[PDB]
Amino acid sequence: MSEVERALDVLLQEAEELCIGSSVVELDRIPTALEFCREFYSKNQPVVIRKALNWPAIGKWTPKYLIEALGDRSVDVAITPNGYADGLATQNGQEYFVLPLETKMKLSEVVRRLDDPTGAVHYIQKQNSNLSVDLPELAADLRVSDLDFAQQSFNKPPDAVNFWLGDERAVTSMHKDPYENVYCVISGHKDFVLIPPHQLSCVPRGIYPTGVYKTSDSGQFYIEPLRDEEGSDQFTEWVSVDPLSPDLAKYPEYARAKPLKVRVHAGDILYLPNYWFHHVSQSHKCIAVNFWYDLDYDSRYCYYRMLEQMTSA
Amino acid sequence: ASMSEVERALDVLLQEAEELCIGSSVVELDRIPTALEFCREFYSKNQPVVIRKALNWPAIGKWTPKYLIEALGDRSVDVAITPNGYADGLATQNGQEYFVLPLETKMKLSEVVRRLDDPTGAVHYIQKQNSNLSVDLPELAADLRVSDLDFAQQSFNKPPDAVNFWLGDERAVTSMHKDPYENVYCVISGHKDFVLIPPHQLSCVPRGIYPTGVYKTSDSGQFYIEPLRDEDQFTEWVSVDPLSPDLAKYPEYARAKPLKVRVHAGDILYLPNYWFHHVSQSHKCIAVNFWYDLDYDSRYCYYRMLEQMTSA
Ligand SMILES: O=C(O)CCC(=O)C(=O)O
Ligand SMILES: O=C(O)CCC(=O)C(=O)O
Ligand SMILES: [Mg+2]
Ligand SMILES: [Mn+2]
Ligand SMILES: [Mn+2]
């Protein structure tokens, strides 16, 4: 074996022997700030806290309640034919990384489309702090100070507060973010598949042309390639494996990955640490809110960049 | 190629750490931080910090040679002796370079102090490590207050694995090395000068494999090196002298960014796990330090991979 493969084997064997990123820790009570810093933040270790929050939103936010309170609020909604916004899809023999069709519609109309199983897949998934921007009133039904146990490790206000409301057909393909993520389910449940960053060499990634979903004048979906002004394709690096049904013949290295599964119910909190890979599915019309905090860099980022170099094409 | 695949990977590591200035300075505080602050800013970042005039222990001031001699009943203490001042350090004999362990003997503290006052004699250091303050000198603990270190100890969440007492000649130098411990270092009298290099700069720090030896005295009291056997024994050790580095022989060291910090009496230095350190001291400097076993995380695994990539 090559020098690089020997090094990656050392990394993976040491992490397995030491149980690094080998489980999602479960707590039945919110930890102290010091506990959270020592056990989860400092160790880049995910944790789920069960029945942590009793926010008024939990039990009150239903599709009906949201229509009554904010039914006329125009919100950004993503639409795909296949349920994979920010996901891989083929057209005319080429695999693209595809961005969703994005549009504005009344929340009332979104809920109506979520209740139509024969139509396209809709998901309010804008991020970009869309709760603060589009649905600020909903803030009164949250108590963000309850998250201080975690926020004290990040020592900064949230970069973003996002509101999520989606079809059970809407699946979030595996990716990673450069944020600390405090994820709070309000209604329904979310199913996460998580892979730690040090298993990068086990996660196949490719470079794909970028496209966006559009509909034709007759209503058929298609993919429009994104291009620069010069006319050259724009490209996105993206995880190539489907963790729900992995093709081990195409991606034998993924047999060495140890993906973790966690379901997050209403009132639970998930800490999803920076740079962890995550794939997400949801119950139908699941509602969630999450808080993103910019990461504080240390040598783990530098090692991860090295690992990207060692696993590059 | 022009560069190995491993060399290209190491160059990316170093470039990214340089742009972010990882481990580029020892943070200086004038007040002890809260436990949460220490965990967030220093422990979780594997980041050294020096806290100035942090401790008011009675030892800082009471501990003179005479006081220690009284308090310990002129006990026989273990002392390390070398001819050159480099216990656990490189030295050459008969054209061969060895990693040399000190001569270890026991003498009354009164005699140690007498020898520390002889510049023409060999270099003496009380530096037993293991846990020689708790195990071999317990009477001294009454002049400290270890709970004052709780701000740090709460991040480690375990008692010290060792508490060491250090009292040395200004000629005694601790060559550059790393430890698999969190270290809380407390100077009692005098000062210590540290040169520190962060773990991710391992590829810049030259290391060799040397035969192991130990200092012994001849018939006439003069020192020589006896090679150590166990059947041929060898030690991996840092090859560079950080005080006057030979950049012609070790050009990679020009990429390291060593940090200098002087730790005075009453100051605390947190030396995080696996940081390289070289240590010099004032004459008859006294220090105590607390070692805590590390709590493994992803960063340790990456470092083990790095050790494999730079095996040298
Ligand atoms: O809820 C989802 O579908 C995606 C959540 C996600 O990717 C995030 O919180 O970063
Ligand atoms: O004080 C010295 O000479 C060395 C201290 C040291 O190496 C340590 O505390 O780990
Ligand atoms: Mg200084
Ligand atoms: Mn995400
Ligand atoms: Mn040491």
Author numbering:
A (entry chain A): 1 to 313
B (entry chain B): -1 to 229, 233 to 313
The study reports:
Jumonji domain-containing 7 (JMJD7) is a JmjC (3S)-lysyl-hydroxylase that catalyses the modification of Developmentally Regulated GTP Binding Proteins 1 and 2 (DRG1 and 2); JMJD7 has also been reported to have histone endopeptidase activity. Here we report biophysical and biochemical studies on JMJD7 from Drosophila melanogaster (dmJMJD7). Like hsJMJD7, dmJMJD7 forms a homodimer with each 316-amino-acid monomer possessing an N-terminal helix-loop-helix-fold domain (aa 1–42) that forms part of the dimerization interface, a core distorted double-stranded β-helix (DSBH, aa 160–294) fold comprising of eight parallel β-strands and an α-helical C-terminal domain (aa 296–310) which is also involved in dimerization. Notably, the crystallographic analyses on dmJMJD7 combined with previously reported crystal structures for hsJMJD720 reveal the unusual dimerization mode of JMJD7, which involves interactions between the N- and C-terminal regions of both dmJMJD7 monomers and is likely conserved in all animals making JMJD7.
We obtained dmJMJD7 crystals of His6-dmJMJD7.Mn complexed with its co-substrate 2OG or co-product succinate; catalytically inert Mn(II) was used instead of the cofactor Fe(II) to block catalysis under aerobic conditions, as was done for hsJMJD720. The His6-dmJMJD7.Mn structures reveal that the overall fold of dmJMJD7 is very similar to that of hsJMJD7 (root mean square deviation of 1.3 Å for Cα atoms of > 90% residues). Consistent with a higher degree of conservation of JMJD7 residues located on the DSBH core fold (~ 68%) than elsewhere, both hsJMJD7 and dmJMJD7 share almost identical active site features, an observation in accord with our biochemical observations showing their substrates are interchangeable. Like hsJMJD7, dmJMJD7 has an active site metal ion (Mn substituting for Fe) that is octahedrally coordinated by the 2OG oxalyl group, a water molecule, and the highly (but not universally) conserved metal-binding triad of residues (H175, D177, and H278). The 2OG oxoacid coordinates the metal ion with its 2-oxo carbonyl oxygen ligating trans to D177 and one of its C1 carboxylate oxygens ligating trans to H175; the other C1 carboxylate oxygen is positioned to form an H-bond with the sidechain amide of N181. The 2OG C5 carboxylate is positioned to form electrostatic/ H-bond interactions with the side-chains of four dmJMJD7 residues, Lys190 (βIV), Tyr123 (non-DSBH aa), Thr172 (βII), and Tyr183 (βIII). The conservation of 2OG C5 carboxylate binding mode of hsJMJD7 in dmJMD7 is particularly notable since this feature is uniquely characteristic of JMJD7 amongst the structurally characterised 2OG oxygenases. Notably, in the 2OG/succinate/N-oxalylglycine complexes, Trp164 is positioned to form a stacking interaction with the methylene groups of 2OG/succinate/N-oxalylglycine; the C4-methylene substitution in N-oxalyl-D-alanine or N-oxalyl-D-phenylalanine compared to N-oxalylglycine prevents this interaction.
